[PDB]
Structure formats: C-alpha cells, structure tokens
From a paper:
The study is based on structural and biophysical characterization of a key M16 family protease, FusC, resident inside the bacterial outer membrane. The crystal structure demonstrated that FusC has the four characteristic domains of an M16 protease, creating the entire “clamshell” structure from a single polypeptide. The first of these domains would correspond to the catalytically active β-subunit of MPP, housing the active site residues with a metal ion coordinated by two histidine residues (H80 and H84) and a glutamic acid (E165).
Alternatively, catalytically inactivated versions of MPP can be engineered by mutating a glutamate residue important for catalysis but not for metal binding. The equivalent glutamate residue in FusC, E83, was mutated to an alanine residue, and the FusC(E83A) mutant was used for structural analysis. The catalytically important metal ion was identified in the FusC(E83A) structure but was absent in FusC crystallized in the presence of EDTA. After coincubation with ferredoxin, crystals were formed from FusC(E83A) and/or EDTA-treated FusC. SDS-PAGE analysis confirmed that both sets of crystals contained full-length ferredoxin in addition to FusC(E83A) or FusC. The structures of FusC:ferredoxin, FusC:ferredoxin (C2H5HgPO4), and FusC(E83A):ferredoxin were refined to 2.7, 2.3, and 1.9 Å, respectively. These peptides define two distinct binding sites for ferredoxin in the cavity of the FusC structure. At binding site F2, segments of a ferredoxin molecule corresponding to the N-terminal 37 residues and the third β-strand of ferredoxin (residues 86–90) were visualized. The B-factors for the ferredoxin α-helix bound to this site are comparable to the rest of FusC, with a number of salt bridges between positively charged residues in FusC and negatively charged residues in ferredoxin contributing to this stability.
Residue numbers in the entry:
A (entry chain A): 26 to 921
B (entry chain B): 2 to 37, 86 to 90
C (entry chain C): 85 to 91
The structure:
Amino acid sequence: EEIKSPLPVFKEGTLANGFRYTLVQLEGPKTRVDIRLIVDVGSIDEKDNESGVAHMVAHMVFRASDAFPQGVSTELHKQGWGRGQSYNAVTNYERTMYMMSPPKGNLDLGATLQALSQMTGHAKLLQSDLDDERKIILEEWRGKLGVAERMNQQRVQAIRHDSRYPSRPVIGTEESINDTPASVLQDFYQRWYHPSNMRLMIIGDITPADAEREIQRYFAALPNVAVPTRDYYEPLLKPQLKVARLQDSQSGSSQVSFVYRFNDKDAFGQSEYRHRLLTQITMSAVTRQVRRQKAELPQDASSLVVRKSDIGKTTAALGFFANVMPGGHDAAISAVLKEIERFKRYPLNEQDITEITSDIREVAQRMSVTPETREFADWVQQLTIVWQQDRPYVGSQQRGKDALEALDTIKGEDVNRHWQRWLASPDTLAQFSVPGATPFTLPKPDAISKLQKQWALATLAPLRLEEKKIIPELPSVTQSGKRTAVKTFAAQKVEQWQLSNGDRVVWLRAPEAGKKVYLTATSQAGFMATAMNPWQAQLASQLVNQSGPATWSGESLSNWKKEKTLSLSIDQEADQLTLSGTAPTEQLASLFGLYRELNVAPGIDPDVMKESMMSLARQKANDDQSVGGKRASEMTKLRFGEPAWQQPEIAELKKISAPALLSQWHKAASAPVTYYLIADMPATQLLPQVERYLATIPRQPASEVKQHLALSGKREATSAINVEPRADILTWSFTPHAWTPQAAVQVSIARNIASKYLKTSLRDDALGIYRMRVDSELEDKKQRIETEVSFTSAPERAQELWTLAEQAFSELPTKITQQDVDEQKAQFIRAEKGRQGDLTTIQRRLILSYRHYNDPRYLSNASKLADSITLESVRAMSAKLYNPDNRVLYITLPQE
Amino acid sequence: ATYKVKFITPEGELEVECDDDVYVLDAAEEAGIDLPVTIET
Amino acid sequence: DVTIETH
Ligand SMILES: [Zn+2]
C-alpha cells in the first residue's frame, strides 16, 4: 500500500448456524483483499488415537470435496493460485487457520468463499487422497527432525508439565502419519468443523453488503452442530518445586533456570488494560535491573535474563535464565536463586520506573492525537493478531487514551506489588541443561529449596545501581610516517603505495565507491602462523573484534560505530587476517583511527570474554560426544590424516587470561598489511590520513602460512552413527590445476552442466534422495579443482548413490552438447555485465589480482572472459571435475 | 564450506557458524544458544 | 508482552 489507509469500518455478523464473520473495509489500495478463516481446533484437541490429525486435516481439506472431486487446491491451481502465496493453512495447539490471497483480489471473493466453504463444510477426506498426501506430510515430519525441534519438546515437557501440550505436538508421530486411516480424520472433521466453531475475516477493498451476501450464500446452509465443551487449555497449577533436565545428546545447551507459573489474566478486580500495562512496566524495569545484576554472578554463571511467556490461554511462565560453565550447574542455580531472593528483598529502582512510565506516556500521548493510518499489509498484521485472540480491534488513537488513563492510576508501589505477586507464585520449576557427558545428577526438590532457605536467611547487598555510560573517543595521533614509494597502474585507476612501516596501500579510485571508503586490510597472520597458538589466536581475534579498543567496551564500540555509520570487522582465518570496513569519506580519520587502535590498543571486554568462554566450553563438551563431533573427526582423518589444531580441554579453557590472549593478538597485528582501499577522492585527501594512522603501526616481517591441503588418494569410511533416520553421503575429489581467470570460468561452466546432468541421471524417486549438491571450483589459493558431491537420502539405497554419480561423471564429457554451452555462455555474458560497476565484485577481483599477479590487471579485460567458453574447453574441463585417483567417500548411516 | 549467521534478538546480537547442510536453528541449538546472513524475530 | 510500543 503506497497511500496509507485510515482506521477502517468494521462490520460483524453471525449467521443463524453460529458462523461469525468480520468485514473490514479499507479505502485502499484498490482491489487488494485478504481472507482468513479460523476453526477453533488444534492439536491439543486430539484424542490419543488422533496424533497429528488436526494438521493432517488442514492438508486434507484441500483435496476432494463435494463440488471438486479432483481437489479444492486443484481447482484453485486451474484459476491461477499458487500454494503458499495464494492459499495456505497453519495449525497450532489451539486453532487451524486458512488464509487466502486471491490473484485478482476482490474480484475473486466469491470463488474464494466457495473454496473455503468446500474446505470446511464439504471435504471428502478420501483414503485415496490421504495415501497420496502422506508423502507430503511425511516429508514435513522429516524436516521437523533434528536437535532444535527435540530441544523445543524438552522445553515444552518441562515448562508445560501437567498439561495437554507435551503429548500433543502439532506434527504428530511417524506412526500416526503412516497408519492413521481416513476414517479417523473424517470423525475428527465431523466432530470439530462446524459453523459455531468457525470465524471469518475479510480485509480490504470490499463492499460490506455484497461480501456478507456472499457469506450467506456459501455458509448459511452448514448444519448448526455444537462441538464439545473444553476447559483443558491450562497446566494444572499447584504449589510445587518441580526439577527437570532439558536434555539432548546433540545440544550444546548449558543453562540453569528457575520459573514461576501463574494465571496471568487475573487482573484482581482492576482494569485489564491497566494490568497488561503494569506487566509491560514491570518487565521493562526487571530487564533493566537484571542486566546490572551481572556483576554479582560467580564465574560459573553468566547472562542472567528474565523472560515471560504464555503457556496456556491464561497461564504465563516467568523465568530467570543464566548460562552455565559446564560442570558448574550447582553454583549457577544457587547464584540464580540468590538474585531472585534479592528481588524479593528490595523494591525496584524508582528512577527506572519513573523513566519507563514517562517514556510510555510520551508514546501514548502521541498515539492519542494521531489519526491511525497503515499500509495494507500492516492492517492485515494488526487485525489478524487481535482476531486470532477472538477480540475486537481497538485503534491506536483509543489505545493511547486508554494508556494515559491507566498510567494515571499507576504508581511505583503498584509495580512492586505486581512484581512480587509473580515471585510469590507457589508453582515453581528449576531446569538444568548440561552438555555432553558432563557428570550430572538431577537435584532433588529438597536440594533446591535448601538453597532458597539459605538465601532467605542471608544478608544481601542492595540491587546494583546503573553505572555511568562510557563515552569513547579515539586518541589524538600526532606521529606520522611517510609514503616511501608510488607505483601507478593508471589503466586500472590504481596506485600502489609503500609505507615507512612496511605496509602497503593498493588504492583504487573507483567512482562506484560513491561517498564511501571501502577498506580491506590483509596480512599473513592467520591463526596457523607458527608463532601463535591456534585456538588462543582465534579466541583473541574474536574478543578484540567484539570489545574494540582497550579503553572502550563491546557496547560503547557498537554505539560509536552506529553514530558514525561505520563498520570494521576482524576475520582471522587459518592462513590470513582480514580487517574489513566501510565509512563515509568524511569519517576516514575515524575509520583509520579505529583500525589503528585495534592494532596497538586491543581490548578484552570481561563480560564478552566470560560469555565466549561459556560458548567454547559447552561446545567442547557437546562436540566430545556428539554425532557432529564424531563426523568432523572422521572426515578430518579421511581427508587430512590429523587435525591442524583443536579446541582446548575445558580445564585449560578456564585458565585463559586477557594478557595471554592479547599476546596472541599482538602476534597477528605485527604482520605487515596491504590496505585495499576503494575511495573516489584525490590522493591529497587520502595520503595524509594514510601517513598519520596507517604508516605508524609497528610491524615485523612475517612468513606465509602453508595452506591446509587434503591428501591425495582413495579412502572411504562408513559410520552408522546418525540419530535421525537418514543417510549422509559425502564425496571429495581434487585435481591440481593452475589458476587462471579462464580456467576458473570453465570449471564454473562445466560445474553447472555437471550438476544438471548428475541430477537428471539420479532423478529416480526410488533412490530416496532428499537433497543433492554438486559443488566444484578452481580454488585459487590451493590451485586445485575441488569437487564435492553431497547426498542426503533414505538409508536403504545410500550405498548406490555415489556409484550412480560416479558413472554420471564418466559419461559427462561426451554428453555435453553445443546447445548446453551456448546457453551457459549467454547466461555468463548476462551475469558478467550485471557485475560491471558492482563494488563487491570489483573489490574481490582487485584482491584476487594481487594474490596471483601482485598487480591489479584482473580489473581489466573482463569482457574477454566469455570468449574462453567453448564447447571444446567446457568438455575438456568437465573431464577434470572428478578425479578417480583422488576420491574420499564418507557415508553416515543411522545407528544400528 | 563454512558460513556465519547472525540473529538480532531483544537479548543482543548472536553469531553462529553453520555448514551448508544444516538448518539455522539446529546450528544455534548445537552451539548452545537459546532462541525461540542476518535474520530477525 | 508490550502494550505500548516504545522502540
Ligand atoms: Zn503441513
């Protein structure tokens, strides 16, 4: 919507059979319409023999119907609708929502209502259609497998314990998807899909009179049948201290939490709007304070946060969560409990409450006098949120007044009282995630309450106060170095400058830079450099990157960059160090100045370091026993023999100090740098800033870091270790080959042709291929064609896949046709011209040029690249993509 | 093939490494980041 | 969650 439309007119209605509808006429944009229907049934309503059936019905109502034996979605496809973009369904615990955006907007309204009434009142739910649809539902079930989903179920089981939700995931079970008969879906549909259990909303360019005549036409005849009464949406709250582990052997989660559960909709005889306003004020106040409380946490805990979430229609959960140093879960839960007790002892900061409520009053004041206007998609979002809750929309103008009124009856003592109610909830829960094989015994409730009593009896210091904001400033730099030499590449608009400290500038005066400067600073200081310690170097690089200069902080660094619209980022790879940044040209001194400070005055923010150590430790604990850690180790032994480096043991990790890490960083920062600078400005503007900030950094010659090169030969392994029901097939092949721009393009062209041929050659659905990837490139640093073919597939015929792809490769060089190359050449030509004037391409080719030629020639003559694409050259290169003498095969199968 | 993903949350910027054949949230969970290219939510 | 958006 380009012209925002004002607050719409709402018309509500109810047919005789109980069907409810909401008509929302916007004055624009012309023809746009959005149509949605909710059936108040979700997975929570399934019986024990109905697992996944709410969601299966949401699929099946698009198949055969009374009016459409070939399927509702079939009919829609024939009239130009696309799945997802034009029609969609979403099922959750409580409700099923059908959404329609007809291609012709409001002209298609009647066809949309005929389709929706067919879906909700006349679905056949045929066994034949279900047996066809099971393919799609099984595929969604497979894609919802993995560690994130498994941990989400761990969390639901704990935080919603004693409710219907843990046993009712929306997707259901593999057995139910495979085995549930259409008859069960029909009974579920006939139980819940009734007009008094359904509601419709139409938003946009409509005539409310016409629309509701269309609604009567398609929905009035549905028989009025009641659905069962339901009062099972909440966990059964009771006074308790429940203790749970959140556990998955592939999860790096290392975390403790303490949670209160309570009825969040009880407003205690007061305005319910005012109650939700007290909740917002309380959460903002607590969020401010609990961040300050980070200074009380011992080394085993970090990042104490408070979160509030809905866990039923009326129940909420208020949780305190903190990351844990693996092995330190006992000390961490005690620290969480101490901080909770401190919140029971002391009132919330009165200045915060004043500031928070004043901020809300300002917004509410502005809302109350501003006519509400929105774009179409925003109206749909705002209206759908309230309609899904089955509540009327209240406009932002009215809500602004409502807030001002409620704010007048809110004092600090109301906030404190609201907060203490949550902390007094008798239904409580302690949760532990402990990664990998870390020794752990689930504490008994008595052990947790023993800590609560300890802190209840202890003397606790007041809540921490807000600390003064650090306002960072770059130092004055008055030492200047000198440029000692200039080499000119006028044809490429490049100058190369030698500086007195040994650095060099490769400056490209590209008009495509506009009013910005682009910096890429490279040196040979990868973390495999011989003077360094690989894991410590990588940790130091990341900590300096996030912390900024010694006298700053992670957060003052982020604020300072934002203010100057400036970026600068450290990336230390195995073989090189790259600092990359952009600034406006008027910020050039601030970009070079920050760059210099990272080199000579690196910082380590203690909060950032503590968090980074937690992250490394929990991943180490997981990787030591996970599937992913096992695969990485076996792939390493197959391709390289031994790892180049490894993360430390956790006990060594815990000993790391800031001076040790800064020592590593200074080893990287001493390597001489080439500054690739893209800036459309005169040298007279650039050179003084170069000489002041970049020529003055101490350097010492560094050696080149040897590349990490996969070993030659044929090796294979098969590991039955997967925890999902899938096979992963990986093959690597390489051929040494000198890098030229022409050869790289030819490799790329043959790759595209090979991918399509290998995919066509493995088209058979009987093979069970879920995903398939063919990668190949002439890697320019290693100067080898590196080819990688990847499979994910059902386990049954995984052993055959690489064999079929191996045969495809041997056929490829005689199956490539003149038309294939002609298509690819024309497609390359079109891409190459879209890369003209592209700054990302220009910067990459400049840097590649210096790597191979030590000059910028690659910025010129790109129009001749396509000429190296011929039928002969592509076929001769397709024959090098796969080299049978250098082949490593790794097959991962499900565990026995 | 190594990549880096970033997530903007009401908690802060969270950065995660992610291979080609891994879903965004599986990588976060493997890394031990509690959530529910730089995306948004 | 948030009843009056501040950010
Ligand atoms: Zn589905």
